[model samples]
Target: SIGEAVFSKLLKVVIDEAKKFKAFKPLSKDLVSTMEILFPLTQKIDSMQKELDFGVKELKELRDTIERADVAVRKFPRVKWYEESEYTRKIERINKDMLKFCQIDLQLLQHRNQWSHP
Candidate 1:
């Protein structure tokens, strides 16, 4: 029921407005490629972080075990040193070494934490 003249005029107006705007939306290809590239890099970083967490936990357990061993050795009942054997002196040196190892483990954990963050 529309007249041909009015329809032609409306088409002309639409063409003019479109020409003024000159806008075109982007395609999905660029964004998809970017996301695909980023995903693997993010996964790699996540894996490294997980490994760091595991190492720190293992170090903590080692330190705790060292402490428990020292306590157990100290608390044993009727533990007298046999002076002729000199075994107690060796035990004393071993205990000192174990304590130092525990401190070194703590330092290593701190260093690893810093490495992951920085």
Candidate 2:
């Protein structure tokens, strides 16, 4: 089939490139030998990329929630309205902690996304 032929050609190209790698030569006796070792590592990196993508999506949702909470917390005056009440104080603290987490998570998300694109 045409698809199989194209894949075979692609594999040939990859094997040629692999042969050119100085580091890879010491690890493999031949192209097939290199691919046998690389196949599992390739699969593992693919899995990690998928996991990173999921983490990015979840982090985005969390950041969105933090933005909404920011707006909600602004409805009342910060210094006087919530100062004396324990409930509002606790809510404010939770919101603050969530914002902090969102910041840290966003940093991680950015770093993860750098390598997630296949």
Candidate 3:
């Protein structure tokens, strides 16, 4: 996730630099497409980051509650247990999305590097 954040920031800078290149140039298509794709991806990453932080807070609260329970001394109230948590699934989905998007971004950047500068 940290790497993704760094990569996203770097992509933003690259996208900005690409805009300086002449418009409608044949070699610029991939870079332009990359920027278009990256805009939504960056937004998604920002949203995912927020969700991850919230999930961490919720998990920490769950852990503290469980730790405070006195299981040995008395019959502790049954805490409702859930499996296949939504939070976990969402995090996994975000991870997959970020990985695929990052790959596409890198490929576009590489394509730009290979093409002759205008």
- As for model 1, its CA RMSD to the true structure in angstroms is 34.4
- Model 3: per-residue lDDT, tens digit, 63-117? 2322222121122112123522533343344334434444544334434445656
Instruction: Provide C-alpha RMSD values for all models, in order.
Output: 34.4, 22.6, 22.0
Ordered by lDDT, highest first, the candidates read: 2, 3, 1
Q: 1 or 3, which is superior by TM-score?
A: 3
Candidate No. with top TM-score: 3
TM-score ranking from best to worst? 3, 2, 1
TM-score of each: 0.27, 0.28, 0.32
- The alpha-carbon deviation from the true structure for residue 100 of candidate 2, after best TM-score superposition, in angstroms, is 4.0
Clashing pairs in 2: none
lDDT of 3: 0.39
lDDT of 1 by residue, 1-118 (tens): 1122322233233323323322311112322232233333333333444334534655455335434433433333334445423434544543454344433443465467767665
Worst 10 residues of 3 by lDDT: 68-77
TM-score of 2: 0.28
